[PDB]
Amino acid sequence: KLHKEPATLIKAIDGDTLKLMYKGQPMTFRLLLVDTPETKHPKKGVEKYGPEASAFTKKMVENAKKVEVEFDKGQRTDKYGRGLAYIYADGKMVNEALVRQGLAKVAYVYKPNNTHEQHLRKSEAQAKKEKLNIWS
């Protein structure tokens, strides 16, 4: 069963990337299963809704009493040494909130790291129906 472990925000870097203190180590985390528009993007620079996605993650996590990380059951770090996880701000999953607000798309999913894929997909369908942000 997946379980939550506490973490301390160091710095929000982008819509989908954060630096956290995890078990005494500063580490970069990449939000599992979501692609947000980018500000630090390799070739196009600032994509549309990039700044908004980034402000949302920043606010959500900065304003939280408690931040927790949830590892899936596959690999826990990617080729760049970033943590792969579901991030919770006061019990609320950041990855899903971004999708529900139309500020992220569900990513190409890699088994076995896909436990909350259906949940997220259901939030994505909804945001699209509501024609929010990315979907407007």
From Swiss-Prot:
The chain holds residues 88 to 223 of 231 of the full protein. Residues 116-136 are annotated as: Disordered. Ca(2+) binds at residues 16, 35-36. The lineage of its organism: Bacteria, Bacillati, Bacillota, Bacilli, Bacillales. This is Nuclease A. The active site is at residues 30, 38, 82. Residues 116-132 have a biased composition (Basic and acidic residues). It is found in: Secreted.
